[PDB]
Amino acid sequence: LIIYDDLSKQAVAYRQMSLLLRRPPGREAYPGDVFYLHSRLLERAAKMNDAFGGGSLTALPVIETQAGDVSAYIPTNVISIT
Amino acid sequence: ATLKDITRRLKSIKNIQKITKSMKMVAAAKYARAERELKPARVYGVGSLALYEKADIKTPELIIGVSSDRGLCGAIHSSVAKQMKSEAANLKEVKIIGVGDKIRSILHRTHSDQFLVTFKEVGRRPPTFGDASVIALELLNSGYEFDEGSIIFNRFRSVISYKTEEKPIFSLDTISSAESMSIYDDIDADVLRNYQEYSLANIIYYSLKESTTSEQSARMTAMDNASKNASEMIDKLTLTFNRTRQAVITKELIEIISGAAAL
């Protein structure tokens, strides 16, 4: 069971790096694949069959919302993944 | 905050501002008529009780609530229900009569089995002595020969001020003959059975004429507050909308320029 506390802070970090790499910003100044950033990661947490080992990886990512707005861009972007 | 949300609440407060505005006006006409119809009805009530105050009447050993149906009048139904439940525990057999539906619902669940009669449509049409007589008839037709009662209502004072008042009704015909009545002569046992019956209809009418004047006045008030609390809330959210409109345009534009100034 892996916890990412929190993924919103990783976004801010990723936004830093991408903008510092001269790569153009998209919505809310976050890079255009800011969905791809978490989706790539959160897909790897999965449940394997018996043929492949029977093991599992659970994911509890954490997202911080401002003023209670879950309908916001980044919140919904992670909701749309988990 | 979003352009979808902001305008939804602006659409609905511009409703309340207006809906409440007319409910102030509806009550404002009903006040002005009830204020004129009270002027004589007061003198009527004055002349009605001018006997029980000039000669002391006690009782050796019935609660009537007067309000209306239509709410939103501030604290008219709630002030009399407080003084009714005050005496519902402080007293002796207690049997309740509530004129106006908003007594059958506010102070019911608590005294559900302590009901004698209920009256509806009060406050729709300005009250008459005819309404008070139907209240008088139903009281005397019920097999409840009460020892003594008290009528609780809202006495008018001004556009904004009123006070919950009690008036004791010594309407027992066995209590009509006391040591203070020994001052009076030339009476029948069954002429008081006529006078007591009528002086009951007077005080019920008086309390009813005070109530519907005190009720419509504070509904006119409560709605003049509520429509101009919405007037303020419209003017507050409207310029909150402009903030958020201009900022959304600006922010949507920085988002482009930032992306254009990176290539």
Swiss-Prot record, chain A:
Binding site for Mg(2+): D5
Tissue specificity note: Heart muscle (at protein level). Heart and liver.
Modification comment: Acetylated on lysine residues. BLOC1S1 is required for acetylation.
Source organism superkingdom: Eukaryota
Protein's job: Subunit alpha, of the mitochondrial membrane ATP synthase complex (F(1)F(0) ATP synthase or Complex V) that produces ATP from ADP in the presence of a proton gradient across the membrane which is generated by electron transport complexes of the respiratory chain. ATP synthase complex consist of a soluble F(1) head domain - the catalytic core - and a membrane F(1) domain - the membrane proton channel. These two domains are linked by a central stalk rotating inside the F(1) region and a stationary peripheral stalk.
Further comment: The siderophore enterobactin (Ent) produced by enteric bacteria binds Fe(3+) and helps bacteria scavenge iron ions from the environment. As a consequence, the mammalian siderocalin LCN2 plays an important role in defense against bacterial infections by sequestering iron bound to microbial siderophores. LCN2 can also bind iron bound to endogenous or nutrient-derived iron chelators and plays an important role in cellular iron homeostasis.
Subunit structure: Homotrimer. Component of the ATP synthase complex composed at least of ATP5F1A/subunit alpha, ATP5F1B/subunit beta, ATP5MC1/subunit c (homooctomer), MT-ATP6/subunit a, MT-ATP8/subunit 8, ATP5ME/subunit e, ATP5MF/subunit f, ATP5MG/subunit g, ATP5MK/subunit k, ATP5MJ/subunit j, ATP5F1C/subunit gamma, ATP5F1D/subunit delta, ATP5F1E/subunit epsilon, ATP5PF/subunit F6, ATP5PB/subunit b, ATP5PD/subunit d, ATP5PO/subunit OSCP.
UniProt family annotation: Belongs to the ATPase alpha/beta chains family.
Protein name from the UniProt record: ATP synthase F(1) complex subunit alpha, mitochondrial
Residues of the full protein shown: 308 to 389 of 553
Swiss-Prot record, chain B:
Record flagged with keyword Zinc-finger: no
Residues bearing PTM N6-succinyllysine: K24, K85, K120, K236
SUPFAM superfamilies cross-referenced by the UniProt entry: ATP synthase (F1-ATPase), gamma subunit
Compartments reported by the entry: Mitochondrion inner membrane
Predominant cellular place of this UniProt entry's protein: mitochondrion
GO molecular function: proton-transporting ATP synthase activity, rotational mechanism
N6-acetyllysine modification, residue list: K14, K30, K85, K120, K163
Membrane topology summary: Peripheral membrane protein
Matches recorded under Gene3D superfamilies: 3.40.1380.10, ATP synthase, gamma subunit, helix hairpin domain
CDD domains tied to this protein: F1-ATPase_gamma (cd12151)
Location of Phosphoserine modifications: S112
GO BP annotations listed: proton motive force-driven ATP synthesis; proton motive force-driven mitochondrial ATP synthesis
GO cellular component, one term: mitochondrion
InterPro entries (UniProt xref): ATP_synth_F1_ATPase_gsu, ATP_synth_F1_gsu, ATP_synth_F1_gsu_CS
Xref: PROSITE patterns: ATPASE_GAMMA
Keywords of this entry: Acetylation, ATP synthesis, CF(1), Hydrogen ion transport, Ion transport, Membrane, Mitochondrion, Mitochondrion inner membrane, Phosphoprotein, Transit peptide, Transport
Subunit structure: Component of the ATP synthase complex composed at least of ATP5F1A/subunit alpha, ATP5F1B/subunit beta, ATP5MC1/subunit c (homooctomer), MT-ATP6/subunit a, MT-ATP8/subunit 8, ATP5ME/subunit e, ATP5MF/subunit f, ATP5MG/subunit g, ATP5MK/subunit k, ATP5MJ/subunit j, ATP5F1C/subunit gamma, ATP5F1D/subunit delta, ATP5F1E/subunit epsilon, ATP5PF/subunit F6, ATP5PB/subunit b, ATP5PD/subunit d, ATP5PO/subunit OSCP.
Function: Subunit gamma, of the mitochondrial membrane ATP synthase complex (F(1)F(0) ATP synthase or Complex V) that produces ATP from ADP in the presence of a proton gradient across the membrane which is generated by electron transport complexes of the respiratory chain. ATP synthase complex consist of a soluble F(1) head domain - the catalytic core - and a membrane F(1) domain - the membrane proton channel. These two domains are linked by a central stalk rotating inside the F(1) region and a stationary peripheral stalk.
NCBIfam families from the UniProt entry: ATPsyn_F1gamma
Family: Belongs to the ATPase gamma chain family.
Protein name in the entry: ATP synthase F(1) complex subunit gamma, mitochondrial
